[PDB]
Amino acid sequence: IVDQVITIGKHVKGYHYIIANLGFTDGDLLKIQFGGAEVSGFQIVDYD
Amino acid sequence: NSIQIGGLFPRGADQEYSAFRVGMVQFSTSEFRLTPHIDNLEVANSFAVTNAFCSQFSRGVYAIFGFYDKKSVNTITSFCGTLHVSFITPSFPTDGTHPFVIQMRPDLKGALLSLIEYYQWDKFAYLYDSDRGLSTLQAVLDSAAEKKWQVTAINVGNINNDKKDETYRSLFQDLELKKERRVILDCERDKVNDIVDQVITIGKHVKGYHYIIANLGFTDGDLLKIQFGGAEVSGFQIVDYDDSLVSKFIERWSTLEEKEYPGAHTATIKYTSALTYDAVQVMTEAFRNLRKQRIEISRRGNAGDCLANPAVPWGQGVEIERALKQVQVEGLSGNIKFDQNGKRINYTINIMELKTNGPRKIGYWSEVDKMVLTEDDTSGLEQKTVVVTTILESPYVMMKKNHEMLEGNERYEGYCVDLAAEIAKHCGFKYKLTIV
Amino acid sequence: TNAFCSQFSRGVYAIFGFYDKKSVNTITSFCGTLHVSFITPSFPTDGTHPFVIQMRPDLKGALLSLIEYYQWDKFAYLYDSDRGLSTLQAVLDSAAEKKWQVTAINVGNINNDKKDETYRSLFQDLELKKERRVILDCERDKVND
Ligand SMILES: *[C@@H]1O[C@H](CO)[C@@H](O[C@@H]2O[C@H](CO)[C@@H](O)[C@H](O)[C@H]2NC(C)=O)[C@H](O)[C@H]1NC(C)=O
């Protein structure tokens, strides 16, 4: 879903995504990291 | 009939070399046979170029086909202009009028300048490296002055590939200072994809951005990763895969053994490679015409040393160069023809826009016709001029005092005329005021 | 290339000379390879070539500063290719960050048969945008012309 969004350009500022699982940092995030859209998610494993 | 020629290839130009070999077999005849001695060299290094040339000279070649960097080209145009050695290249045109250099690459500057007035740009950002000279950048700076353009030229080639990230943000902050949306890319094909990739990541490839790729190979690189972005991408093609000549070429090309002809297993070929294939045909017709005109050209001995003092050119160099420059043939890059300096003339350049279903020609450019759009107009432009009927009554609809000199909607004035505007404005349509 | 080798064959220990934008690479690559040291008053290399002792100091930094001192924002930059468009790019690279409107008119390609005409055709062409601030960037002779 990410890659598809990336290619049609729905990851710029104004857009906003909330990833609904306990593994936000379990998957790739670099490919949306600088686009402009807002990404949110949940982490159940605190590395700190 | 053993004719010796010089071959100068840069390390890792594999497809260009394979194309050179298919050209060998295809245009080889039984009248004569071109015997190519190949020199694999770091074309950027001038020392190695000077050496490799002197080697080809001392062996006794009749002409050299090769490439050059802009850093190296001067060594080439010197040793060729001096020793009358003929040089054939798909590399970029020389800054001026150099003799004994047969530049297969068509001049691109004239094409690009046409396209800019076509899209009617007035303010853009020109990005570049120096690797093909700055003779193009001079062209966009002398034009901008004469046609009122504001150009933000940024040199993006000196960027180190070791810290190649902070250099891009600060680049697109300076390119966000004037909200620059129109950008030209005049770069090495490698540098092209690196920039595109970065542009995708920061999301400057949606609707509202319009990029122009300044090279002879539009469909050469990768286009699919900004094909759905929304941004419109234009560029130039010198290899038309619709020509039956090129189409028949592709069939054998795409099917060759790849262990033997590397990078030749594709449905597309780089223009750098394609020109090399065209260059072989020219080298054949050149030496064919030299015997059909019964002119003798064989070496009267060793060329010995290229640094021989004083330098004395062999005679037939004048004759050979002329033969080359008088060639007219048809190959992969459309029609081929030269002037007295070895520059392309009368050549076609396809204009391609990136769409949804892939790259697409919207027209072609000639050095004589300038910008010509192929009659492929679409029916999409609705522009349904909504016919608005009205009556000649005061003060609803009235003729203006000098309606004669005026035309269209401007002829009439009045309440309903003013209303016709407010209606069409809020409803969004172009309309024609006509009396019943 | 012939002169450099002629000097080298004799076994000189160093070489003093001048070069051009259409010959600099030759001097460098043959001095980088043969480790011959070159001492030049000519314009410095657009890089980090070794064995080349450039006597003239880098100007680039100074000119940029002086323009900033005069508080300019829109000017014309007549340039000569003869010394390598390094400085032309230096002000062009800065044109964004410093916010400049630079008109870059090449001038190192005119002939002395129509010298008096083209030079007037340039200035009666900047009577268009009506700029008054110019930079010359030329070998002294192209200045006086
Ligand atoms: C200039 O280029 C044109 C178009 O590439 C060349 O035109 C072709 O000429 C041949 C031989 O007369 C015809 O068979 C073709 O039909 C033409 N191709 C076209 C028009 O697409 C022409 O040869 C070149 N002119 C000169 C003076 O060299």
Curated annotation (Swiss-Prot), chain B:
Biological processes per GO annotation: cellular response to amine stimulus; cellular response to brain-derived neurotrophic factor stimulus; cellular response to glycine; cerebral cortex development; chemical synaptic transmission; conditioned place preference; establishment of protein localization; ionotropic glutamate receptor signaling pathway
Keyword Ubl conjugation (UniProt): yes
Disulfide cysteine pairs (residue numbers): C54-C306
Tissue-by-tissue expression: Detected in forebrain. Detected in dendrites of neuronal cells. Expressed in the pyramidal cell layers of CA1 and CA3 and in the granule cell layer of the dentate gyrus.
Compartments (UniProt record): Cell membrane; Postsynaptic cell membrane; Postsynaptic density membrane
Glycosylation sites: E232, N346, D376, Q383
Entry note about domains: The M4 transmembrane segment mediates tetramerization and is required for cell surface expression.
Record-given protein name: Glutamate receptor 2
Lineage summary: Eukaryota, Metazoa, Chordata, Craniata, Vertebrata
Residue numbers of the full-length protein present here: 25 to 466 of 883
